[PDB]
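ligand=magnesium ion
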Amino acid sequence: SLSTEATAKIVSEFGRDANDTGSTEVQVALLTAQINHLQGHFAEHKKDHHSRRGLLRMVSQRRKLLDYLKRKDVARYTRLIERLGLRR
RNA sequence: GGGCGUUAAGUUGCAGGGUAUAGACCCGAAACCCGGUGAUCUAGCCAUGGGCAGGUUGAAGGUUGGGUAACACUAACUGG
Ligand SMILES: [Mg+2]
């Protein structure tokens, strides 16, 4: 997984408030990260029909939690995705 | 006793009949062997030049959108 030194960084950048691991801004970023990284890893082997599942489980959550914004505070949704370019 | 012999005179020319050896009365093979001339036709190849009116179909690749976590994938336009 992402280095312990990593998550603690991204959070202080996306976390709705100074140092907080829970809000979508923080949730998403923390997820998209491991997703972008693993992408390369999977570009290798590509036979790990197990590790890939996790890739899905978390990715399936990305689009999932991302909806919470719409269903709730939409004002940030677009402001959050525009950050990682997600959705496209 | 028997077989072959012993009272046939030959031989050398010349003309001729026949034979042997040679092409052997004459004309005729299909082929065999030897040494040369031929790839200006044609078969293959080698180098170097040239030729193919018009009309048609429309692959791969690509750009865009859709699409997938990323690919797959998909539809147009292009491309040829
Ligand atoms: Mg007698």
